Amino acid sequence: LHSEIGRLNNQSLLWGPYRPNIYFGTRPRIGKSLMTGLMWGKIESYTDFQHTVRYTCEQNEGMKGYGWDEYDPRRGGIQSIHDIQNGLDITTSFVKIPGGAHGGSWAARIKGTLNDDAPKDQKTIVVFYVSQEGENSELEAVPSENEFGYEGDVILKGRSEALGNYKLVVTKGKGVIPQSDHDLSRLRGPGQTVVQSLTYPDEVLWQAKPILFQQLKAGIDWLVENKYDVADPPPPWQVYLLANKPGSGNVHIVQKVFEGDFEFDILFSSESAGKEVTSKDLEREVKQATEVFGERFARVFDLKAPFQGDNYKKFGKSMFSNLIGGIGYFYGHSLVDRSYAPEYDEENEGFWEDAAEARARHQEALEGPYELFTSIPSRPFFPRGFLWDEGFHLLPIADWDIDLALEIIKSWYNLMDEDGWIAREQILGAEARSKVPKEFQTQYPHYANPPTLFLVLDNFVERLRKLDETLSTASVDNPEVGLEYLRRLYPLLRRQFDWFRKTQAGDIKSYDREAYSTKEAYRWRGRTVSHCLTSGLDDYPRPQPPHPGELHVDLMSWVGVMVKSLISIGSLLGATEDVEFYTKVLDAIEHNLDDLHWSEKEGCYCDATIDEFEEHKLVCHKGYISLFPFLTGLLKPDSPKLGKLLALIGDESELWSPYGLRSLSKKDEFYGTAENYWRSPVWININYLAIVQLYNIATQDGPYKETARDLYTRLRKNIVETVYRNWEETGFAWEQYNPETGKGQRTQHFTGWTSLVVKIMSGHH
Numbered sequence: 001l002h003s004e005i006g007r008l009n010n011q012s013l014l015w016g017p018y019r020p021n022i023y024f025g026t027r028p029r030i031g032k033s034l035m036t037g038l039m040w041g042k043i044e045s046y047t048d049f050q051h052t053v054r055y056t057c058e059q060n061e062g063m064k065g066y067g068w069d070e071y072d073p074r075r076g077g078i079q080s081i082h083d084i085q086n087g088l089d090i091t092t093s094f095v096k097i098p099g100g101a102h103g104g105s106w107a108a109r110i111k112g113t114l115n116d117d118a119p120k121d122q123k124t125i126v127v128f129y130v131s132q133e134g135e136n137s138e139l140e141a142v143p144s145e146n147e148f149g150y151e152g153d154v155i156l157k158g159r160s161e162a163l164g165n166y167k168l169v170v171t172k173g174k175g176v177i178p179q180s181d182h183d184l185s186r187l188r189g190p191g192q193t194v195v196q197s198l199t200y201p202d203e204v205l206w207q208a209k210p211i212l213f214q215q216l217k218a219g220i221d222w223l224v225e226n227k228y229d230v231a232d233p234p235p236p237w238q239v240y241l242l243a244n245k246p247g248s249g250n251v252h253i254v255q256k257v258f259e260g261d262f263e264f265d266i267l268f269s270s271e272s273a274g275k276e277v278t279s280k281d282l283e284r285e286v287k288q289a290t291e292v293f294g295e296r297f298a299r300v301f302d303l304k305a306p307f308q309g310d311n312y313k314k315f316g317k318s319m320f321s322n323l324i325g326g327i328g329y330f331y332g333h334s335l336v337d338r339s340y341a342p343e344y345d346e347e348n349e350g351f352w353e354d355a356a357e358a359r360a361r362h363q364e365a366l367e368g369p370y371e372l373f374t375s376i377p378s379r380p381f382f383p384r385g386f387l388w389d390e391g392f393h394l395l396p397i398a399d400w401d402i403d404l405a406l407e408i409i410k411s412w413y414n415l416m417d418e419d420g421w422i423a424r425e426q427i428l429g430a431e432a433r434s435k436v437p438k439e440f441q442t443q444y445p446h447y448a449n450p451p452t453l454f455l456v457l458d459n460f461v462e463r464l465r466k467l468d469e470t471l472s473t474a475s476v477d478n479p480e481v482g483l484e485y486l487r488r489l490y491p492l493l494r495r496q497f498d499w500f501r502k503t504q505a506g507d508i509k510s511y512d513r514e515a516y517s518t519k520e521a522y523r524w525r526g527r528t529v530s531h532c533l534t535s536g537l538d539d540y541p542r543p544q545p546p547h548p549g550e551l552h553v554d555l556m557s558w559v560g561v562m563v564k565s566l567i568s569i570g571s572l573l574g575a576t577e578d579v580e581f582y583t584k585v586l587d588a589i590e591h592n593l594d595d596l597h598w599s600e601k602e603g604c605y606c607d608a609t610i611d612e613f614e615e616h617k618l619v620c621h622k623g624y625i626s627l628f629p630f631l632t633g634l635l636k637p638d639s640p641k642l643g644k645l646l647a648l649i650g651d652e653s654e655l656w657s658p659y660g661l662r663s664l665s666k667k668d669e670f671y672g673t674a675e676n677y678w679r680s681p682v683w684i685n686i687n688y689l690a691i692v693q694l695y696n697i698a699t700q701d702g703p704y705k706e707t708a709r710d711l712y713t714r715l716r717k718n719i720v721e722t723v724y725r726n727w728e729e730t731g732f733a734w735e736q737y738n739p740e741t742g743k744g745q746r747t748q749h750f751t752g753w754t755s756l757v758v759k760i761m762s763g764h765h
């Protein structure tokens with residue numbers, strides 16, 4: 001029944017619009033298979049279309065905004081795109097229709113409406129691009145009846161081992177098709193839907209834009225060769241309309257030109273399912289998905305006061321739908337330096353120069369292929385898996401669909417190597433690499449990232465202790481299924497725990513250091529003079545200079561998180577020998593947090609280093625790092641230390657801004673310096689941890705119950721209102737928020753952990 005829920009999950013999740021790096025496209029969760037993507041652009045001249053055409057996600061002045069209004073990867077959703085450059089409001093609806101043995105069928109409607117500013121007679125070129133990777137597979141456009149192209153629907157018939165037999169239809173659509181009265185129309189037709197069927201080596205099929213443009217370019221060269229010239233030139237839209245040549249191939253380009261508003265459907269029919277999908281099915285299934293989305297949201301994300309209003313509901317739906325709508329499937333090789341050069345041990349003073357020397361050996365090589373099914377922080381800027389981000393992403397997603405979240409956790413853990421390492425940043429395949437300067441592709445087996453995926457596991461454990469409907473909660477509702485999941489995952493968690501303690505160990509013994517335990521002390525590897533990228537808090541101030549004797553209190557707290565999880569999970573699996581070891585580790589971290597990291601003088605936790613005179617010194621920089629044992633749930637609710645931490649949190653002159661907690665205190669010497677990334681701005685992920693911890697203390701007997709209640713109430717409100725106000729005014733989630741002005745800044749479309757706001761509004765932690 002665990003093998004069974006698994007198969008049912010696989011079949012349900014197989015198809016999706018799982019290409020968030022592009023405006024709209026589909027692919028199944030199979031490395032080498034059938035992919036689609038949409039392109040569009042206005043054409044006003046002989047040279048403009050190359051600049052107007054849209055394919056991969058971006059954000060600039062030419063794009064008002066875009067995103068998912070509604071989304072559930074089992075059912076589908078509706079995306080809306082507000083394109084200024086192209087004077088178009090576009091809607092792409094996607095729906096899955098279960099049936100057969102190959103993961104079912106799906107349909108999409110593409111709808112374009114010119115905005116008020118666009119010329120009423122705008123010509124827009126629209127391309128549906130279809131590619132198929134695999135050695136023993138086939139795809140063929142059924143030729144037209146007409147001589148120059150298609151009056152009606154374009155049918156592609158194809159087959160592969162993975163998908164069996166299928167048909168993909170691009171429907172005729174609705175809208176004016178311009179007609180050219182030029183001489184060229186005698187050889188090219190007056191204007192109609194066209195299809196080119198081509199083949200390239202599999203590994204380049206993702207390059208849809210260059211491949212399209214190469215075909216457009218060949219058509220223009222034919223014009224020149226055949227005496228079509230500036231003395232009497234065809235209209236632009238006809239110059240850029242491909243000559244029809246349907247056939248067999250692994251690439252099929254379907255092109256339409258419309259004048260004014262337009263729409264057309266894409267109908268994927270899995271043959272093994274029986275009756276093929278129609279446009280009427282699409283409409284019915286689209287209405288039904290919306291109804292189901294609506295019912296689930298109201299239930300799962302029941303927004304509490306003072307955010308019960310309709311405005312907050314629309315806001316929460318946008319934030320949530322963009323988070324879960326970012327889910328992608330990525331496949332291909334990763335770039336990894338497997339030299340384990342000794343310079344990477346960072347055991348000496350000045351280690352960063354040595355590590356630079358090793359990296360300059362460039363021993364990195366491609367390995368894999370790997371796959372990953374994950375949500376992402378940023379469609380336009382970094383559409384790929386980041387390890388500690390995903391832990392936050394899955395917190396609202398798990399509420400919605402725990403089986404989906406567990407599927408993503410599993411996907412991430414399947415990347416763990418033999419030592420216990422998962423690369424913190426997952427750049428899988430040439431397509432993912434295209435978006436990443438080469439200097440930034442290499443992953444390093446000594447670089448960690450916070451184990452926030454344990455927080456998701458913690459939530460599932462609590463739920464376990466206490467057809468698409470059934471599927472989403474099968475792993476909690478059948479306790480047998482849940483436990484088997486944990487049983488199979490558990491050794492990997494254990495392995496990652498051991499990996500942290502082996503590779504990210506700090507040095508107690510070599511120095512004049514005294515502490516309850518000789519073992520518990522941690523130091524993030526990979527730090528440079530101005531950064532610590534592995535911790536997640538890029539440029540938060542750390543001991544200067546970096547030093548092999550540094551200890552990082554956030555890292556110790558994360559190990560605290562993992563060991564607590566391993567206690568709950570080990571206990572469920574009856575790993576008595578394991579649970580006893582974990583229990584002594586936790587006790588030791590509890591003591592060493594105080595012994596190595598507590599500053600009585602400052603009233604907070606601090607990272608530690610080793611002096612010019614070889615002595616332990618605390619280095620205090622009041623901000624998120626200072627709060628870490630509190631943020632990660634490690635302190636007792638009557639701890640006097642927790643009480644001082646609450647004072648720091650609520651202190652307006654330190655961390656407390658009207659817009660949320662500042663990443664660094666206004667009193668710190670490093671406040672608003674350098675790139676000022678984590679040196680003052682309000683970040684939603686850390687604020688979320690604070691809010692959740694305040695609520696815990698607020699809902700429990702103790703001396704700080706009422707302080708916590710007040711801070712909970714205000715912080716929740718301040719964070720939610722800041723994200724809402726910015727969303728209302730800009731249409732975006734932002735990466736971080738200015739604590740002086742309240743403005744969203746850095747990158748837009750950050751959904752992304754900013755989307756945690758849905759769960760903050762929902763409350764009842």
Ligand SMILES: COCCCCCCCCCN1C[C@H](O)[C@@H](O)[C@H](O)[C@H]1CO
Pocket residue numbers: 377382386388389437440536537538
């Ligand atoms: C150098 O430039 C070339 C590469 C550019 C792309 C860099 C990837 C963007 C990272 C964004 N972001 C920075 C946060 O401090 C991290 O905590 C967070 O995990 C990460 C992902 O959301």
